[PDB]
Amino acid sequence: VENPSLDLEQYAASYSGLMRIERLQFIADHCPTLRVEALKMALSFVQRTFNVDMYEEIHRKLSEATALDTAWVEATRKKALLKLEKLDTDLKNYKGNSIKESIRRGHDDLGDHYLDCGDLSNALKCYSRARDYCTSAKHVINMCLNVIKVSVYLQNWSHVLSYVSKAESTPEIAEQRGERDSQTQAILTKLKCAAGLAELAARKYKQAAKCLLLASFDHCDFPELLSPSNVAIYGGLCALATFDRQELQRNVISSSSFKLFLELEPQVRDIIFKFYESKYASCLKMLDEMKDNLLLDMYLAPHVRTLYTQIRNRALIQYFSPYVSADMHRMAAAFNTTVAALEDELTQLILEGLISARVDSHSKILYARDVDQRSTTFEKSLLMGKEFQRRAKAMMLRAAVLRNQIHVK
Amino acid sequence: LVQCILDNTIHGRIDQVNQLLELDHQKRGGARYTALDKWTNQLNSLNQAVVSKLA
Amino acid sequence: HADLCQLCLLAKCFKPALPYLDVDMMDICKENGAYDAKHFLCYYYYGGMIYTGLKNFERALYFYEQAITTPAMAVSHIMLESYKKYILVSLILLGKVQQLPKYTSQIVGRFIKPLSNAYHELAQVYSTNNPSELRNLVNKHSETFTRDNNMGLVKQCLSSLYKKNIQRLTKTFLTLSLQDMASRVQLSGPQEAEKYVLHMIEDGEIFASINQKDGMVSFHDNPEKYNNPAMLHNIDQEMLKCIELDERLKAMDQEITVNPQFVQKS
């Protein structure tokens, strides 16, 4: 009930743009006994950034699901339309001026207006029109980052993947082996983080962890795409669920760059350290404790549950990696479950071939079966020979019936 | 022992019921069996390829 | 051959036709151009029914598949019945409907399948390993099976589901209680499970032993080491069959080479 880990003021001040609006909307949508507080802060604190339509949507959903000072909103709408028309006229003037700097600044103002207004269709049309006008690599980089951001907002990951692949393949295969590591070019960390978010949201956890672990704290000081806390959360959870022991050791525990992210969110660091050092009761207990906070998240919640199961399964397999005979009672105690539920889970794991073992339910012991390579080779060869003989004797009959030109009319 | 086995440092397994460590002084020249398995798989694939050509 | 198989089927005397079904047909008598495809289809269908009557499900499946894969451009009732019985036999002998060979007519395989939809959904619910749903759906299309006289094969599928569940229990367990097995495979009683496992071991379909002191079943999945002269003889017989198959193939190849139309076209 009591938790001092959440610094609400710093968390709110750390976000810029529409990110925090979506964050509070998502938490307040499915949070019990906290919706009133979130709505109170939304009404009292965030009044700027042109909150009109989603206020009406909230009113409509609260009314049907469970005069007015229209002059100001109409004046602001007309002012926005007039500003857009003025910017369009200025852009036409810049086009007629035949100055590259003029058209570049016009495009910059148009992009800023589209960012602060929310219109995306005309933004896509303008980007399609201006894609053919590329002269310098830096401008292409900025426009690619902008289109990546708008595709992330649109929740369309195919364009994200295509643009990322284009950006990587353009400079002679990512500058061959690799140049001097990032000194002040924080763009590569930003694009890696965007690609990680896109891959995570595309039900691809392994690649998301692979391309998200390559981040630097000194170059992750942009709290507008993905905060350090949830970046560490994702990089820990995906690595725990999908990475094997060797690469988890060589990419998380051995990685000194990720140590800062791990201490930023101590829970994930403790989870990974306990999982690595064959500790599962405490690890799974803390995973269950943190699951409630993970479900309140935005970009991880729909992908949390499956990830969790994966982690558990991995733990299960690891628990039987050094054993040829294991006690089911100790295993159940280590996995915070009863012997019957553990037996069912291990039965399911053995059925799909993840664990090569056999359960003895009399003494409740999980033995390890050893496949006899000689016997299985012999039986597979004999079965293949039998199948070959059947197939050949069917093919001979088919040849006989085709030679006779026998068919049904 | 669990940490060393998980690290591929110790080639062995643990009897929890008997409190034992059984080492891996095994795995003789069974490459013949893997070669025969590959031969069987290639033969099965060639079977399906040849038989289903026309007739 | 078709008439002999039909007479053996109608007279309920399957033994006489056995020597004329165990051999594999190679080349077909032309009968002066009076050998219709109906004779081939009905011969293979009746051989399949004879084999299903004698519990030889592997050869019955082979016969049904041979009947189905006859090239055609129309719909035949023999072919449709062969398809239904092939689905049933593949559900009995194996745990799934065996995939038909690729060299089948592409047009006859789009019209017969919708007609036999009850059997396809029977396989679909069979793959869920739930006997209760299988029985409910059998009662739902009892009329279709009774009209097609496929009853008895459906009950055999019902029993084979229980047998397959018991067999799958050995892929996970070394030793299991009678009550646990009965609850897992839904036989509703330790005694019924014990009788089922006893019959399964008696037929050789499973390696297990029953201990009535604790009411337990232990699966000993270590049958053979492949180090005895009996396996030597078995491999010898398989090699002899393969060698005779190759000799027949070479004879057919030489016959097709000596044919005057060959070489002239090549």
Curated annotation (Swiss-Prot), chain A:
Record localization: Cytoplasm; Nucleus
An example Gene Ontology biological process: regulation of protein neddylation
UniProt KW keywords: Cytoplasm, Nucleus, Phosphoprotein, Signalosome
GO cellular component terms given for this protein: COP9 signalosome; cytoplasm; cytosol; nucleoplasm; nucleus
Tissue expression notes: Widely expressed.
SUPFAM superfamilies in alphabetical order: Winged helix' DNA-binding domain
GO molecular function terms listed in the Swiss-Prot or TrEMBL record: GTPase inhibitor activity
Residues of the PCI domain: 211-373
InterPro entries xrefs: CSN1_C, PCI_dom, Rpn7/CSN1, Rpn7_N, WH_DNA-bd_sf
Gene3D superfamilies tied to this protein: 1.25.40.570
Role noted for this protein: Essential component of the COP9 signalosome complex (CSN), a complex involved in various cellular and developmental processes. The CSN complex is an essential regulator of the ubiquitin (Ubl) conjugation pathway by mediating the deneddylation of the cullin subunits of SCF-type E3 ligase complexes, leading to decrease the Ubl ligase activity of SCF-type complexes such as SCF, CSA or DDB2. The complex is also involved in phosphorylation of p53/TP53, c-jun/JUN, IkappaBalpha/NFKBIA, ITPK1 and IRF8/ICSBP, possibly via its association with CK2 and PKD kinases.
Family the entry assigns: Belongs to the CSN1 family.
Domains (record comment): The PCI domain is necessary and sufficient for the interactions with other CSN subunits of the complex. Mediates the interaction with CAPN8. The N-terminal part (1-216), which is not required for deneddylating activity and CSN complex formation, is nevertheless essential for other aspects of CSN complex function, such as repression of c-fos/FOS expression.
Subunit structure: Component of the CSN complex, composed of COPS1/GPS1, COPS2, COPS3, COPS4, COPS5, COPS6, COPS7 (COPS7A or COPS7B), COPS8 and COPS9 isoform 1. In the complex, it probably interacts directly with COPS2, COPS3, COPS4 and COPS5. Interacts directly with inositol kinase ITPK1. Interacts with CAPN8. Interacts with USP48. Interacts with ASB4; this interaction negatively regulates GPS1.
Protein name: COP9 signalosome complex subunit 1
Gene of this entry: GPS1
Curated annotation (Swiss-Prot), chain B:
Subcellular location: Cytoplasm; Nucleus
Domain of life: Eukaryota
PTM: Phosphorylated by CK2 and PKD kinases.
Family: Belongs to the CSN2 family.
Entry function: Essential component of the COP9 signalosome complex (CSN), a complex involved in various cellular and developmental processes. The CSN complex is an essential regulator of the ubiquitin (Ubl) conjugation pathway by mediating the deneddylation of the cullin subunits of SCF-type E3 ligase complexes, leading to decrease the Ubl ligase activity of SCF-type complexes such as SCF, CSA or DDB2. The complex is also involved in phosphorylation of p53/TP53, c-jun/JUN, IkappaBalpha/NFKBIA, ITPK1 and IRF8/ICSBP, possibly via its association with CK2 and PKD kinases.
Subunit text: Component of the CSN complex, composed of COPS1/GPS1, COPS2, COPS3, COPS4, COPS5, COPS6, COPS7 (COPS7A or COPS7B), COPS8 and COPS9 isoform 1. In the complex, it probably interacts directly with COPS1, COPS4, COPS5, COPS6 and COPS7 (COPS7A or COPS7B). Specifically interacts with the ligand binding domain of the thyroid receptor (TR). Does not require the presence of thyroid hormone for its interaction. Interacts with CUL1 and CUL2. Interacts with IRF8/ICSBP1 and with nuclear receptors NR2F1 and NR0B1. Interacts with NIF3L1.
Name of the protein in question: COP9 signalosome complex subunit 2
UniProtKB/Swiss-Prot annotation, chain C:
Cell location: Cytoplasm; Nucleus
Sequence ranges assigned to domain PCI in this UniProt record: 56-224
Cellular component terms per the entry's GO annotation: COP9 signalosome; cytoplasm; cytosol; nucleoplasm; nucleus; perinuclear region of cytoplasm
Tissue-specific expression: Widely expressed. Expressed at high level in heart and skeletal muscle.
Modified residues (Phosphoserine): S266
GO biological process: in utero embryonic development; protein deneddylation; protein neddylation; regulation of DNA damage response, signal transduction by p53 class mediator; regulation of protein neddylation; response to light stimulus; signal transduction; ubiquitin-dependent protein catabolic process
Coiled-coil segments on the chain, per record: none
Signal peptide per UniProt: none
Keywords noted in UniProt: Acetylation, Cytoplasm, Nucleus, Phosphoprotein, Signalosome
Entry similarity comment: Belongs to the CSN3 family.
More about this protein: Amplified and overexpressed in some osteosarcomas (OS), suggesting that it may participate in TP53 degradation in OS.
Function field: Component of the COP9 signalosome complex (CSN), a complex involved in various cellular and developmental processes. The CSN complex is an essential regulator of the ubiquitin (Ubl) conjugation pathway by mediating the deneddylation of the cullin subunits of SCF-type E3 ligase complexes, leading to decrease the Ubl ligase activity of SCF-type complexes such as SCF, CSA or DDB2. The complex is also involved in phosphorylation of p53/TP53, c-jun/JUN, IkappaBalpha/NFKBIA, ITPK1 and IRF8/ICSBP, possibly via its association with CK2 and PKD kinases.
Protein name: COP9 signalosome complex subunit 3
Record organism: Homo sapiens
